[PDB]
Ligand binder design. Structure first.
Ligand code: R5P
Ligand code: R5P
Ligand code: 2PG
Ligand code: 2PG
Ligand code: 2PG
Ligand code: 2PG
Lengths: 257, 256, 257, 256
C-alpha cells in the first residue's frame, strides 16, 4: 500500500512560512512518488502550557493560508479542531481532520469531524491504552467516518515524560490505519528529545505502520512552538529516504492483523 | 470553611437530583461547619462507548439544577465541555467545573473565568502537580478569583490511576485543593469502591480544602459510574469521619 | 493492637552514632508505652549507586554494635541481609530480619531468613504489585516464618521517581502486617523528598497500618547515606506523637480485612 | 560482530540443552557473521511461587552447560545469584549474566568481574537508562573489560513492562547493548508472544550490538516462561530477518 507522510510546521506562524515548507514538501512528493504527502499545520494551539505563549492568527486566517498551500502546490491538507463548530469550516480545505490527543474522547468533536465526509486522524491520548482506541473508532464509524487513522504520540510515564509502547502499533492496527508521530513522542510535557526522533522513527517503520507524522520547520530554533522538537526542513528528505528503505526490508515480516 | 461537593454523577432526572439534594440539604443543616455544594453533570461528554448514556441535554440539566438550588438553597456546580456553555451554565452554577481531559483548553478556561463565577479545574491524569500553576494563571488572566484544583489520580500504566498525595501540598501553593474521592479509584477504560473511604481519610490527614464525592441512592442502578458512586446512606458517616480526622490532623498541616 | 515504630540511622556509621540514636529511642519507648520500638541500622549498604559510596564496617562489626545497643537499652533489633549465609549470624542479635526491596523475590534469601525463627520484614520491591506480595508471604510461611511484615516503600513511577499507592496498605494487609516506610518512599532513585515525609506518613496512619519505618540521624546533613531523607533525631518525638493521634481518631474507621 | 544469545530458559535436562544446542550449532554454521552464545539458567532464583520449578542445581547445571560447549563448541552464558557462585560458574561460562533484580548488588558484580570473564548485566525494571553508567563503573573497578548491558523492559504500572527504545542509544555510551526480546514482553506477576518479533525488529532498526532470545522446542511444555519462549523452529527466520534489517538500518545508527 502507499505509505503516508504527514509534515509541516507546528503552527501557521505566517502564510509565508507555509509556502516555504510547502515548496520543499512539493519537491519531495515529486521525488518520492510511492509516498502520499499531506501538509500539516495548526491554525491554533488551543492548549499551550502558559497563557503568554503563541496560539495562532485565527481560524479564518489559517484556513486561508492552508488553502493557498493546497492551491499552489496541489498537496492534501490536514489541520486539527478543538471544538465541534470548527469542523464544518475546516472541512472546506482539510482532507484529513485531526483530533488532538487530549480530546480523543470528546464524542461531539468526533461526531462533528465524522459527518463532514473528510478523513479523520485521532491522536491517541497520553492517558489511553492501545486497546481502548477501539471505541474511538466505533464512535467515528457511527458518525459516518469511512477513512480513519490513529496516531501514536506517546503515553504518560511518570511526570513530564512520555514513552512509546510500540506494542500499540499492531494493536490499534486491528481497527484503523496507524500513524507514528515522530515529533511529539519524544517531547517532555511541561529523554533529550531531538536526538531520539530519528531512532524511534526507525523503530516505528521496523515494527510496521501506515504513515509517519513529523513537524518540520526551516529554522526550529526560531519556531513559535515545539522549537526543540521540530525537525529542520533540510533533514526531511534524509529521514524519508531512510524510513522507506527500512520499511521495504522489514515489510515482508509485517504480521497480518 | 471545609468544602464538600457531592451529588449524582449524571442528571438521570430532575427527580433524582431532588432526592439526593434532600439528603444533602439535611447534612447541610447537620454540619454547619461544612460548605456543601451540589454537583451533577448535564452531559457525559466522553463516555467510552457511543452507545452509553450521555444525558437529557444542557437545557433540561440547567433546569433541574435550578430546581435544586431553589427547593433546597444549595450552591451548585456542574461541568462544561465547550466554550459556548460557560454563559448559560453560569446562570445556575456557583462553581463551573472543568473536566480533567480539558484542563489545558485555554478557550474553555477563559470562558469559565469570564462568567465571574468560581472555577474548579480537574487536574488531568497526564498532568504533573507543579504544572497546574499555569492552569491557575490562565484563569487569573481571565478574571477568575475563586479557583480550585481537584486531585483525581494520575495515569499509572494502562487502565489504572494512582493518587500521589504529594500533589496536595504542591497545588495548595497556588489554589484551594479539592480531593475527588470517587474518580481517583476508578480504572480507566483495585476493587475501586473498597478504596474510596481509605483514600479520603489519607486526603484529609495530608490536608486539603475540600472533598468531591459522587453519591447515588442506588449506585448499582446508576447510568454512569455505577461501580464508584457512593450509596447515599453512607455519605453522613464518611463526612463525620473526615471532619473528626481533619480536626486532629489540621494541627499538623504544613504552611503553604 | 500495639503500633510498631522501626527507627534508627540508615547505616551503622560508628558504634557511637548507634548509642546516640539508641538513647533517644530508649527515651521515647519509655514515654510512648503503647508503641513497640525496634532499633534499625544496616551493617552494609549492598546496593549503593556508585562504587565510591559508603558501604559499612562489615557484618562482624555491625552485629557487634547492634548487640551493644540491644544490651545497653534493652531495645529490639532489626537489620537487613543481602545473601543467604548472613541469615544465621544476623539472627543472633536481630529480632526482625529485613529483606531488601530489590531482593523481595529471592527465594533462598527468604528461606534463609525464615528458618532462623526470627520475625521477617520484606520491603516490597518498587517493581512489585501489591497483590503479588501474597506469594512472598507464602514462601516465608513455607520456610517457617510465623511473624511476617510487608513494607510499603514506593513503586516505580517513570524514571528516578517513586509514588505511594496507598491502596496497597489494605491489600497487603490481607496476608501480613503492614509497615509504612516514611523515608524511602519520598526518595528519588538516582518530589522534593524531605518536605513530603510527614504528610505521607499522616496518610499512612489515616489509611491504616501496623507500623512505620523511619531512618533518623542526629545530623542528616552529615550522614554517610540517605542524608537528604533521614529525619533529624530531634523531630522524631513530634512525628510519633502526631501519628499516634491521627491513628487514634482514624482507627474506628479502619476496615476489617 | 553481531551477538545472538539464545537457548532454553531453564536447564530442564542435559538432554534438552543438547537438542537446542544442536540447532544453535547449525545456525552458528549458517550465519558466520553472527556470534552465537548458548544461554540457560541452572536455577530460577525468583519464581513467584515456592511450588514452581527452580532447577536441578548448580553442579548439574554447570555439567550440562560444559557438555554443550564440548559437543558443539558454542560459547556459554548463565546467570549467578549470589557472590559465591561467580567462581564455579566462570569455569564454563564465557559470559556471566547478572539478573535484572540484582543489577545493583555490588558484591555480586565485583565477584563476576573477578573471574576475568565477560559480564552481561540485565537492566533492572526499576532502573533509568543513564543510571546504568554506575553499574558499568563498578564492573570496571572490579576488573571487568567486556561489559554488556541488556534492555529487558521497564516497570509500567502494575504487572506490565514497556520497552523505552531511547535506552538503547543511551546505554551504548558506556557499554555494548543487548536487547532481551523475550522478557521484554512478559507481564510480571499484551499477548506477549505476538509482540516478540515486532519489538526485535524495532531493536535492530534503532541499533543494538546483540539480541537475547529464549527458545524451546516445545514452549507449551517448558517448565519456565512457557508463554514467552520462542519455538526453536522459528529461530532461523527471525535471525535472518534481523540481519537483513540490520544491514539496511546500520547505515543510520548514530555515533555514540
Ligand atoms: O497539543 C499540543 C502539544 O501538547 C504542544 O506541542 C504543546 O503546546 C506543547 O506545550 P508548550 O506550550 O509547553 O510548548
Ligand atoms: O536499598 C537502599 C536504597 O535504595 C538506599 O537508600 C540507596 O543506597 C540509595 O542510593 P544512593 O547510593 O544513590 O544513595
Ligand atoms: O499534532 C498537534 O499539533 C496537536 C494535535 O492536533 O497536538 P497533540 O497531538 O498532542 O494533541
Ligand atoms: O467529575 C466528572 O463528572 C467529570 C468532569 O466534569 O470527570 P473527570 O473529573 O474525570 O473529568
Ligand atoms: O531499608 C533499607 O535500609 C534497605 C533494605 O534493608 O533499603 P530498601 O528497602 O530500599 O531495600
Ligand atoms: O534472563 C533470565 O533468565 C533471568 C536473569 O538471569 O531473568 P531477568 O533478566 O529478568 O533477571
Amino acid at each position: 500500500e502507499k505509505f503516508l507522510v504527514i509534515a509541516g510546521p507546528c503552527a501557521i506562524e505566517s502564510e509565508e512560512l507555509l509556502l516555504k515548507v510547502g515548496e520543499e514538501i512539493k519537491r519531495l512528493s515529486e521525488k518520492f512518488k510511492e509516498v502520499e504527502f499531506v501538509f500539516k499545520s495548526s491554525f491554533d494551539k488551543a492548549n499551550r502550557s502558559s497563557i503568554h505563549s503563541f496560539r495562532g492568527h485565527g481560524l479564518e486566517y489559517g484556513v486561508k493560508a492552508l488553502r493557498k498551500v493546497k492551491e499552489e502546490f496541489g498537496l492534501k491538507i490536514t489541520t486539527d479542531i478543538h471544538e465541534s463548530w470548527q469542523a464544518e469550516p475546516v472541512a472546506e480545505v482539510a482532507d484529513i481532520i485531526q483530533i488532538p490527543a487530549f480530546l480523543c474522547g470528546q464524542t461531539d468533536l468526533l461526531l462533528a469531524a465524522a459527518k463532514t465526509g473528510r478523513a479523520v486522524n485521532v491522536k491517541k491520548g497520553q492517558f489511553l491504552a492501545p486497546w481502548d482506541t477501539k471505541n474511538v473508532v466505533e464512535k467515528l464509524k457511527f458518525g459516518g467516518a469511512k477513512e480513519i487513522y490513529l496516531t501514536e504520540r506517546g503515553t504518560t510515564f511518570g511526570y513530564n515524560n512520555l514513552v512509546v509502547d510500540f506494542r500499540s502499533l499492531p494493536i490499534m492496527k486491528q481497527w484503523a490505519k496507524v500513524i507514528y508521530d515522530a515529533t511529539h513522542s519524544v517531547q517532555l510535557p511541561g529523554g533529550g528529545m531531538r536526538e531520539f526522533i530519528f531512532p524511534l522513527i526507525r523503530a516505528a517503520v521496523a515494527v510496521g505502520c501506515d504513515g509517519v507524522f513529523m513537524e518540520t520547520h526551516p529554522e526550529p530554533e526560531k519556531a513559535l512552538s515545539d522549537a526543540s522538537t521540530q525537525l529542520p526542513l533540510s533533514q526531511l528528505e534524509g529521514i524519508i529516504e531512510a524510513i522507506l528503505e527500512i520499511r521495504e526490508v522489514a515489510s515482508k515480516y509485517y504480521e497480518t492483523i
